[PDB]
Amino acid sequence: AKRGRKKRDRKHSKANHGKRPNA
Amino acid sequence: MLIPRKVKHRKQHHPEQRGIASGGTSVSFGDYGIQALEHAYITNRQIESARIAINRHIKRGGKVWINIFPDRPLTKKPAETRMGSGKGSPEWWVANVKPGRVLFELSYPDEKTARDALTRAIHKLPIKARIVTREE
Amino acid sequence: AELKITQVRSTIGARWKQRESLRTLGLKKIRQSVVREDNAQTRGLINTVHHLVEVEEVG
Amino acid sequence: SSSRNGRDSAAQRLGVKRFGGQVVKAGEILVRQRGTHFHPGVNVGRGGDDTLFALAPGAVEFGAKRGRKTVNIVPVARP
Amino acid sequence: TANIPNKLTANVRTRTGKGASRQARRDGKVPAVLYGHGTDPQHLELNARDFAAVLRSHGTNAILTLDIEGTEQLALTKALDVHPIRRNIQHADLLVVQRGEKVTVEVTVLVEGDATPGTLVTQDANTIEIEAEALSIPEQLTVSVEGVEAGTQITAGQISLPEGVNLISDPELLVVNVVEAPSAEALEEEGA
RNA sequence: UUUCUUGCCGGAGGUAGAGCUACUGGAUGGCCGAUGGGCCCCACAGGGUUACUGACGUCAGCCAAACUCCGAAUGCCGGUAAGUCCAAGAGUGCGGCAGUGAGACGGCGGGGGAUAAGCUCCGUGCGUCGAGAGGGAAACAGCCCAGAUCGCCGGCUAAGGCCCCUAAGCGUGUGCUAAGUGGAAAAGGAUGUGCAGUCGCGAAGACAACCAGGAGGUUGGCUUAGAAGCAGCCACCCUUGAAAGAGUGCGUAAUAGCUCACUGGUCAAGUGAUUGUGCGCCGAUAAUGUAGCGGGGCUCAAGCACACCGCCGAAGCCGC
RNA sequence: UUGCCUCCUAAAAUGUAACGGAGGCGCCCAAAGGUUCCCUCAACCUGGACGGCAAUCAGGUGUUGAGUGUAAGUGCACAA
RNA sequence: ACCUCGAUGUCGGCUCGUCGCAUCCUGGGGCUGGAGCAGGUCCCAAGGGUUGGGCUGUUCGCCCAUUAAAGCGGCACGCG
RNA sequence: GUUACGGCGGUCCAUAGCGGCAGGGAAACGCCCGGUCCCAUCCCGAACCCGGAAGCUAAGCCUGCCAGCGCCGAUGAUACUACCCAUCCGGGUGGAAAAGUAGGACACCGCCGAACAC
Ligand SMILES: [Mg+2]
Ligand SMILES: [Mg+2]
Ligand SMILES: [Mg+2]
Ligand SMILES: [Mg+2]
Ligand SMILES: [Mg+2]
Ligand SMILES: [Mg+2]
Ligand SMILES: [Mg+2]
Ligand SMILES: [Mg+2]
Ligand SMILES: [Mg+2]
Ligand SMILES: [Mg+2]
Ligand SMILES: [Mg+2]
Ligand SMILES: [Mg+2]
Ligand SMILES: [Mg+2]
Ligand SMILES: [Mg+2]
Ligand SMILES: [Mg+2]
Ligand SMILES: [Mg+2]
Ligand SMILES: [Mg+2]
Ligand SMILES: [Mg+2]
Ligand SMILES: [Mg+2]
Ligand SMILES: [Mg+2]
Ligand SMILES: [Mg+2]
Ligand SMILES: [Mg+2]
Ligand SMILES: [Mg+2]
Ligand SMILES: [Mg+2]
Ligand SMILES: [Mg+2]
Ligand SMILES: [Mg+2]
Ligand SMILES: [Mg+2]
Ligand SMILES: [Mg+2]
Ligand SMILES: [Mg+2]
Ligand SMILES: [Mg+2]
Ligand SMILES: [Mg+2]
Ligand SMILES: [Mg+2]
Ligand SMILES: [Mg+2]
Ligand SMILES: [Mg+2]
Ligand SMILES: [Mg+2]
Ligand SMILES: [Mg+2]
Ligand SMILES: [Mg+2]
Ligand SMILES: [Mg+2]
Ligand SMILES: [Mg+2]
Ligand SMILES: [Mg+2]
Ligand SMILES: [Mg+2]
Ligand SMILES: [Mg+2]
Ligand SMILES: [Mg+2]
Ligand SMILES: [Mg+2]
Ligand SMILES: [Mg+2]
Ligand SMILES: [Mg+2]
Ligand SMILES: [Mg+2]
Ligand SMILES: [Mg+2]
Ligand SMILES: [Mg+2]
Ligand SMILES: [Mg+2]
Ligand SMILES: [Mg+2]
Ligand SMILES: [Mg+2]
Ligand SMILES: [Mg+2]
Ligand SMILES: [Mg+2]
Ligand SMILES: [Mg+2]
Ligand SMILES: [Mg+2]
Ligand SMILES: [Mg+2]
Ligand SMILES: [Mg+2]
Ligand SMILES: [Mg+2]
Ligand SMILES: [Mg+2]
Ligand SMILES: [Mg+2]
Ligand SMILES: [Mg+2]
Ligand SMILES: [Mg+2]
Ligand SMILES: [Mg+2]
Ligand SMILES: [Mg+2]
Ligand SMILES: [Mg+2]
Ligand SMILES: [Mg+2]
Ligand SMILES: [Mg+2]
Ligand SMILES: [Mg+2]
Ligand SMILES: [Mg+2]
Ligand SMILES: [Mg+2]
Ligand SMILES: [Mg+2]
Ligand SMILES: [Mg+2]
Ligand SMILES: [Mg+2]
Ligand SMILES: [Mg+2]
Ligand SMILES: [Mg+2]
Ligand SMILES: [Mg+2]
Ligand SMILES: [Mg+2]
Ligand SMILES: [Mg+2]
Ligand SMILES: [Mg+2]
Ligand SMILES: [Mg+2]
Ligand SMILES: [Mg+2]
Ligand SMILES: [Mg+2]
Ligand SMILES: [Mg+2]
Chains D and B touch (3+ CB pairs under 8 A): yes
Q: How far apart are CA B50 and CA B125, in angstroms?
A: 7
Q: In this structure, are residues E122 and E46 in contact, taking their beta carbons and an 8 Å threshold? A: no
Q: How far apart are CA C6 and CA B134, in angstroms?
A: 59
Q: How far apart are CA E82 and CA E51, in angstroms?
A: 13
Chains C and D touch (3+ CB pairs under 8 A): no
Q: How far apart are CA E107 and CA E126, in angstroms?
A: 8
Q: How far apart are CA D49 and CA D46, in angstroms?
A: 8
Amino acid at E62: A
Which of E83, E124, E84 is CA-nearest to residue B25?
Answer: E84
Amino acid at E36: G
Quick one: D59 exposed, middle or buried, by C-beta within 10 A (0-12, 13-18, 19+)?
A: middle
Q: Which residues of E touch B3 (CB under 8 A)?
A: none
Count the neighbouring beta carbons within 10 Å of the beta carbon of residue D24.
19
Which one of D1, D2, D4 would you mutate to disrupt binding with B, by most B Cβ within 10 Å of its Cβ? D1
Would an 8 Å CB–CB cutoff place D9 in contact with chain B? no
User: At D41, is the secondary structure helix, strand, or coil?
Assistant: coil
Ligand 13 center–CA B24 separation, angstroms? 27
User: At E170, is the secondary structure helix, strand, or coil?
Assistant: coil
Q: In this structure, are residues B98 and B14 in contact, taking their beta carbons and an 8 Å threshold? A: no
Nucleotide nearest to E81 (CA to C1'): I77
Statement: the CB of E102 is under 7 Å from strand I:
no
Statement: the CB of D2 is under 7 Å from strand G:
yes
Q: Element (H or E) spanning C47, and its range?
A: helix C40-48
Q: How far apart are CA D10 and CA D6, in angstroms?
A: 13
Residues 6+ apart with CB under 8 A from E71: none
Amino acid at E125: A
Q: In this structure, are residues B132 and B106 in contact, taking their beta carbons and an 8 Å threshold? A: no
Distance in Å, alpha carbon of B83 to nearest chain E alpha carbon: 36
Q: Which residues of E touch B66 (CB under 8 A)?
A: 191
Q: In this structure, are residues E31 and E91 in contact, taking their beta carbons and an 8 Å threshold? A: yes
Q: Element (H or E) spanning E25, and its range?
A: helix E18-26
Statement: the CB of B4 is under 7 Å from strand I:
no
Interface of E with B (CB under 8 A): 60, 82, 84-85, 87, 120, 122, 126, 179, 181-184, 187-188, 191-192
- Per DSSP, the residues of D54-71 read ESSSEEEEEEESSS-EEE
Which of E67, E134, E84, E124 is CA-nearest to residue E104?
Answer: E134
- How many CA atoms, within 13 angstroms, populate the side-chain half-sphere of residue C40? 0
Q: How far apart are CA B62 and CA C15, in angstroms?
A: 61
List residues bridging with E157 in a β-sheet.
none
| Residues with a beta carbon under 5 angstroms from ion ligand 2 | A 23
Q: How far apart are CA E45 and CA E77, in angstroms?
A: 14
Q: In this structure, are residues E65 and E8 in contact, taking their beta carbons and an 8 Å threshold? A: yes
Quick one: E107 exposed, middle or buried, by C-beta within 10 A (0-12, 13-18, 19+)?
A: buried
Q: Do E182 and B62 touch (CB under 8 A)?
A: yes
Q: How far apart are CA E111 and CA E174, in angstroms?
A: 13
Work out whether the CA dihedral E89, E19, E24, E16 comes out positive or negative. Answer: negative
The CA-based angle E53-E163-E152, given to 5 degrees, is 90
φ, ψ at C38 (rounded to 5°):
-105, 35
Statement: the CB of D34 is under 7 Å from strand G:
yes
Q: Resolution of this PDB entry, in A?
A: 3.0
Q: In this structure, are residues E140 and E109 in contact, taking their beta carbons and an 8 Å threshold? A: yes
Which one of B2, B25, B63, B127 would you mutate to disrupt binding with E, by most E Cβ within 10 Å of its Cβ? B63
Contacts 24+ apart (CB under 8 A), D70-73: D70/D38, D70/D39, D70/D40, D70/D41, D70/D44, D71/D30, D71/D31, D71/D38, D71/D39, D71/D40, D71/D41, D71/D44, D72/D41, D72/D42, D72/D43, D72/D44, D73/D24, D73/D41, D73/D42, D73/D43, D73/D44
Would an 8 Å CB–CB cutoff place D7 in contact with chain B? no
User: At D76, is the secondary structure helix, strand, or coil?
Assistant: coil
User: At E10, is the secondary structure helix, strand, or coil?
Assistant: strand
Q: How far apart are CA E89 and CA E31, in angstroms?
A: 9
Chains B and E touch (3+ CB pairs under 8 A): yes
For chain C, the chains sharing at least 3 beta-carbon pairs closer than 8 angstroms are: none
Closest Cα in chain D to B81: D1
Which nucleotides of strand G are protein-proximal, with an atom < 7 A from a CB?
1-9, 13-16, 18-24, 73-76, 78, 80
Strands of C1-59 (E only): list them: 2-7, 33-37, 53-57
Q: How far is the CA of E120 from the C1' of F269 (A)?
A: 46
Q: How far is the CA of E105 from the C1' of G60 (A)?
A: 42
Distance in Å, alpha carbon of B57 to nearest chain E alpha carbon: 11
Which of C36, C29, C37 is CA-nearest to residue C7?
Answer: C29
Which nucleotides of strand I are protein-proximal, with an atom < 7 A from a CB?
10-14, 74-80, 83-85, 87-88, 91-96, 100-103
Q: How far apart are CA D14 and CA D22, in angstroms?
A: 18
Q: Do E191 and B25 touch (CB under 8 A)?
A: no
Would an 8 Å CB–CB cutoff place B132 in contact with chain E? no
- How many CA atoms, within 13 angstroms, populate the side-chain half-sphere of residue B57? 21
User: At E119, is the secondary structure helix, strand, or coil?
Assistant: strand
Which of D26, D12, D25, D17 is CA-nearest to residue D62?
Answer: D17
Q: How far apart are CA B26 and CA B95, in angstroms?
A: 17
Ligand 24 center–CA A22 separation, angstroms? 13
C-alpha distances (whole Å) from E182 to each of B66, E51, E190 are 17, 43, 10
